[PDB]
Swiss-Prot record:
Consequence of substituting residue 386 to L: Relaxed product specificity leading to equal amounts production of 5-epi-aristolochene, 4-epi-eremophilene and premnaspirodiene with cis,trans-farnesyl diphosphate as substrate
Key word Magnesium present: yes
Organism: Nicotiana tabacum (Common tobacco)
Domain notes: The Asp-Asp-Xaa-Xaa-Asp/Glu (DDXXD/E) motif is important for the catalytic activity, presumably through binding to Mg(2+).
Name this protein carries in UniProt: 5-epi-aristolochene synthase
Amino acid sequence: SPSLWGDQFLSFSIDNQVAEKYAKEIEALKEQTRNMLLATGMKLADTLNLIDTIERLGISYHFEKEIDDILDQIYNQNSNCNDLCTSALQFRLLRQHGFNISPEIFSKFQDENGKFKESLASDVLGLLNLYEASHVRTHADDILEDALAFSTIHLESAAPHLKSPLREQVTHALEQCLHKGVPRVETRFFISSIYDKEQSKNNVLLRFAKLDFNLLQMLHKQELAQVSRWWKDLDFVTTLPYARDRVVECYFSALGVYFEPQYSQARVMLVKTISMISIVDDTFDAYGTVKELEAYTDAIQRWDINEIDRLPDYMKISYKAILDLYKDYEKELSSAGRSHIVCHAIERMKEVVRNYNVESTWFIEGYTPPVSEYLSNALATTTYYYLATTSYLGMKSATEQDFEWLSKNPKILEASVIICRVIDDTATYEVEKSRGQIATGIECCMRDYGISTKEAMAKFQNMAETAWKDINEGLLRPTPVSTEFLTPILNLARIVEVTYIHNLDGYTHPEEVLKPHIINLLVDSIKI
Ligand SMILES: CC(C)=CCC/C(C)=C/CC/C(C)=C/[C@@H](O)P(=O)(O)O
Ligand SMILES: [Mg+2]
Ligand SMILES: [Mg+2]
Ligand SMILES: [Mg+2]
């Protein structure tokens, strides 16, 4: 299907006048908020709720240091706001920030048999925070083994009779927990559906959240326009008609990896790569021959525009565009002398191409590999090792030692890649199966373990579960690299959860899952 967006994003003229107005009041609101954080004499519950609100409002990136200092202090003090609500929240915020706070803070809320006291089933605010906390657990938090099921059943039971906006918050949470959602998406929901309708809302924070969100949206729109023109000038739409035209959906991903203004250059580099690798994918799937695909793979490994001759005219178009793109990246980074890092992204791309070729070889032979062998090849084809690597290109702070750590396939990255693989395999099984693609994950799983499609899917779900625990562990201090370089990997996993929510295929169908988000993040501004 052709792009549903049209030339809608092609042109965007920022009203510098309005943007300057927003920038100026935001700066003042920023300081008022800073002083709220630095206020002495606040109770623990009030301090935690303040930080939690600023994060959900999507403005916490302005106070990364003040929030860190406060959570550090709270971490170094340990306490018993003897209630579930404050305890679960404290646990969650500390864990999401890398502080390894003990899970035993939940002991006082469980019986002698390890299970949560059923007598808490009437504390909705406690159940909600426990619910959100249950999603940041690691392999060492067996104490929280039943937290999810427990809080879920009682939240479902209470939801219908709660007041608004709390009811909407509970219902949304049951459908999408905070820890695993895309930040801009959760922030947009919280601001206009929840906080804006909160009777006890803090008008200063709300004003701040709306203006900042809309101000950034202007930046996002500018970037997307810039990328749309770039995409239009390549004109693969008329040249390579077999390919998908989803530059908008590709941008959403880049936006999900990082939304901060300081990452503008990174987002633009990232979208172009996602967009570009998407064409290579379509070329291997619906268009090329074993001979064509073979020469394509080889040309890519050699990586020299002298190879453009050994390729069919249509593949010459893809190939040249790819080398030019990396040449542009090299050019873009000259200024800072960070052009030497481009090679890391290139090596990852070559890897994706190789496995794509193996993937098609498996399809042609009708091979159904054991899960073990399937993953050895299918993990890279998610393109995730490649996107994570690509996401660092525009991060002015990323060093050679940072890429070096990533090149070794750290557990956190591996976890994120596995999540994308198993979830995608579960959501796209039946469709790929109807295409004769018998080397699909669920199939390999079924044959390998000699189980049903249901049992296989359930197995992949456990792999995803295990993978999230690994990610949560990977965020704990001391981290192998700055948190700044872990967040992009976490966000990639989040994008997976959001794109295939309820096992709906949002990869093969944009209008089914992403359309709403794209409208709320890139079309409609939050009305003040
Ligand atoms: C806005 C965006 C980016 C939405 C979708 C993001 C998402 C998680 C893409 C999954 C990529 C997979 C794994 C494709 C193949 O490996 P295949 O076609 O073989 O399943
Ligand atoms: Mg493919
Ligand atoms: Mg698939
Ligand atoms: Mg496929």
